[PDB]
Amino acid sequence: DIKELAVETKNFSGAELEGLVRAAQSTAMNRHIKASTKVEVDMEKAESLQVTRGDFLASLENDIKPAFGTNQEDYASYIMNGIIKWGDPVTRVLDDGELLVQQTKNSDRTPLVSVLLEGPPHSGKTALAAKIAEESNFPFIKICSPDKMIGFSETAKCQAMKKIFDDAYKSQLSCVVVDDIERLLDYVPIGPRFSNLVLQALLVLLKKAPPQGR
Amino acid sequence: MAGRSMQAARCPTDELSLSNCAVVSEKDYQSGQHVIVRTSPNHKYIFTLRTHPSVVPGSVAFSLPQRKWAGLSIGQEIEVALYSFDKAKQCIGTMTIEIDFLQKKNIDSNPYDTDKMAAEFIQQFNNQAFSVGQQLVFSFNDKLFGLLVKDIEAMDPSILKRQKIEVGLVVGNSQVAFEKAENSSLNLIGKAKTKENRQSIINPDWNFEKMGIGGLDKEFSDIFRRAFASRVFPPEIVEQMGCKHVKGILLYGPPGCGKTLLARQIGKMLNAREPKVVNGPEILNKYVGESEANIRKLFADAEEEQRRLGANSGLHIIIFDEIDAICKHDTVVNQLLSKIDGVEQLNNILVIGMTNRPDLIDEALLRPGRLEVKMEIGLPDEKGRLQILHIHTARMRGHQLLSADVDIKELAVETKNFSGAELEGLVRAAQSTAMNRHIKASTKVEVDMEKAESLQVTRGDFLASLENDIKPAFGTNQEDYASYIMNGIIKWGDPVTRVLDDGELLVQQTKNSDRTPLVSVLLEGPPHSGKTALAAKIAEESNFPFIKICSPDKMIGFSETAKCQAMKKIFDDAYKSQLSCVVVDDIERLLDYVPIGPRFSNLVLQALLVLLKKAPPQGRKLLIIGTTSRKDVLQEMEMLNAFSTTIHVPNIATGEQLLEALELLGNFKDKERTTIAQQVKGKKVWIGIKKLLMLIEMSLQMDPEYRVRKFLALLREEGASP
Amino acid sequence: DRTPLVSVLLEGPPHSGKTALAAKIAEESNFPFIKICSPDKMIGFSETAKCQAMKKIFDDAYKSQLSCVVVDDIERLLDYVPIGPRFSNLVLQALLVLLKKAPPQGR
Ligand SMILES: Nc1ncnc2c1ncn2[C@@H]1O[C@H](COP(=O)(O)OP(=O)(O)OP(=O)(O)O)[C@@H](O)[C@H]1O
């Protein structure tokens, strides 16, 4: 069926659908080929060369990698050893996250909501945000982390952050994560010596309604 | 019925734990009754109740699997309400249950009859509530298994009179289907084995041994499926389907891992031409008019063939190289893009791009229609090395010139981090040494026909050649150690024994653990106490295939960005091995610190802080060792939170230690030793080992009469308060 | 053999002949290779150039199997001035790093 395939591809660009269709045929037609000292086209089963649902499903999961769509590696290495209960605080945090992520999807007077986690160091406040993001179920999920800006100057950081935030305005729903806000600003208490060109952009960005109805 | 607030408890007996039924008191409920447990407004669970006398009234007991599944904790409050099942619809017909061994220590390969498992499951859990995703423990033949509910189906109407549901009631006529978990070794036999998610790919039956390529199977299959799969069917069918042939492939990986063979070998699988190599940097020739002229000349043959034969010519190939340099020049990139993509382009071409830098590659050149299929070729694992050695040593084994002592498995196990191009070199070196064995060439070059028979390559030939001929790239750095540990290691007291002992308790954890793929340790102490000489002595004994030392002496006069780039490059190189160990020493000098100000480079500190907390790709392990002399300064910058542990290397602080160290150094005689002991047995000592060595060397220069006097005067002058 | 590298610092009051006296010890050394690096030869140079000069001098000294390099007026080399204080960090770092790097084996 063609109707069903239009509900499992979310935020798929125009050309990637052509890509999926093209990749759904090589797998179907790669079965009916036998090679023995030379690739030889099969003869007995040459007929009945029909593309089947299996090809489409395999191509949708391991062939086309979308661009403006959910990732599968970013929030795969952050949460490392699952989450295990040790009292009330875990339940409280998870429930609050779920409430916020449902408000940001069934509301019309507040298109933008932001929440800040904090606590003492070495407490697990970066594996409790990726879990909320993965349970959000939003089509577009990115992760802006300082791990990919080693050695950058201030201007490069500003440009990268602006581009990442801009990319999030092209979908009907979006969730974004910022890790170690203290590291983006380069705080060092022999000082301080913060960067005033990144702190005057991070403040502005967090108050900017998306274009319309997003 | 309305609901009452109870308290969670622990299961009283193992038998009730296996029953999967929450234990309650008779005064509260009755056996067989089903209830719903509420932990939050959005958390509800259904359980089957069983009565046991030991359960205190007002509390509900749950087994460990139940608590984990429902997120319950002992002592937490829950709400319990009586639950009624609609047997007309909630009756269950069939189950699909994922069964896996509960304990890894008791895994066995013996077959299990699923038909008996279903009968036992029904006989036990009849008239019990089950929900999708429920985790429980099932006992069969005195064996414990972990069962996970996957699917639930409604029961059909009776004869007198397959809906999917989330929860229902199990009965005697219910059917159970068992499926082994992913990668499970459980063996299931019988008719109750129906499973789901049965989707895979069927590929042609290749014979890798006859080819030459070994250890690269999935990449070959995927490339053949995605790139060349649609250039062998008749031209009529492809026209009907409307497909468009792919026009690009980008393979990247370390140098010398079979990248070019993986293309040449597939070249002759299809009747076609041979590749025309084109170097990456050679195309950059001075001025325009030669580079463009040659670029045009590249495709002349293909254009002529297409004009002559139209859509019937054979395929051509162009094995690129170092595409990183040619792109980012811009004229060449634009010309290539126009030739491949646009309106005027050829349909009998296929560009294969190769490179070593995957990140520096340009973005505009990677997009559907252009180079699209990007693949990675990595270092071979044990099986790859075994197959490569088998294939590369077939001709010799066919002529009966290989001794029976040679074991391929042992060589594969010993050789670690070998790329694969060196594996060929090892065989050549072994053959060369074996041949040189029998050359009786003294006086004049001759041949020893007496022992020329059986020109074999015995294990000694391989091992003797593995240490003086082949130097792996991603391998041990065996020359640095001679410059750092200059005068051995001397055990001058208890502390040295302890510190070195720690060097094991960490080095083992990084090799035999999976919950901690990154460890760190910061060695520190007073100046001239021997810190940098105790890190190499541990990294060497760690027995790790890859070792490096990022000393600051190799970078003199560098600017901040250069140091950051160098450190990033070293760490990136270290990331590409199954095991590693990176030693960074004299951290204070890297930061460019000086007490006035203070002043330091604010960028290197941030780079170092970020690097010390970034885990490597999955399945690989790392270990970082530091070395510093100013601990308070490093604590002010908040740097001891990054490191996981620290050790304290002490200084010589007793007369006995001084005397014993002097003895072990073995320089002075007995009379002078006694005199020094008498003179120095009434004062405190605070001296570094390096300073002690330097003082001894300085004092040995004087004449024999006044050696002891000079040594004692120097020690007195050097002595200072702690 | 236990101390392939040795360094000694001469200090004293201003205009006490420290600069010239060391040249005497250097001459009496009889070492095959000798060299003196002084700020006088470096007038108007930039900070990035003096580091290269020092690196080249030490690299040349490494080659032989015996050497004796003399540096005079370590303070004036830094551009130190009592006011501030002020100086060049790069030169100080190069000096500190280069005073502990031993030469190849046997030299
Ligand atoms: N609430 C939790 N319950 C159980 N396990 C947890 C919990 N939070 C985190 N973990 C586990 O502990 C580890 C958390 O490491 P993580 O990198 O998140 O540390 P952190 O203290 O949050 O980091 P940082 O110091 O950079 O802020 C992961 O293995 C995660 O699985």
Ligand SMILES: Nc1ncnc2c1ncn2[C@@H]1O[C@H](COP(=O)(O)OP(=O)(O)OP(=O)(O)O)[C@@H](O)[C@H]1O
């Ligand atoms: N038990 C020992 N522990 C440490 N060093 C020893 C020992 N026995 C002998 N040595 C010698 O001590 C010297 C160690 O000096 P090292 O290079 O570690 O200096 P350091 O204390 O790190 O100096 P710095 O303050 O400049 O960093 C080496 O020559 C080593 O041969």
Ligand SMILES: Nc1ncnc2c1ncn2[C@@H]1O[C@H](COP(=O)(O)OP(=O)(O)OP(=O)(O)O)[C@@H](O)[C@H]1O
């Ligand atoms: N006995 C002596 N010892 C040392 N220098 C002497 C002596 N007699 C004469 N001189 C002269 O004194 C001078 C000492 O050298 P010079 O003046 O360069 O050193 P300095 O005054 O320490 O320099 P600076 O002030 O820059 O450190 C030389 O001209 C040397 O020949």
Ligand SMILES: Nc1ncnc2c1ncn2[C@@H]1O[C@H](COP(=O)(O)OP(=O)(O)O)[C@@H](O)[C@H]1O
């Ligand atoms: N997977 C493999 N199996 C067998 N031999 C291999 C394999 N990979 C590389 N080799 C050997 O190493 C050499 C690889 O050279 P090549 O890959 O062309 O160099 P480069 O990787 O620099 O292009 C070949 O001669 C081949 O015999």
Ligand SMILES: [Mg+2]
């Ligand atoms: Mg973190």
Ligand SMILES: [Mg+2]
């Ligand atoms: Mg040292």
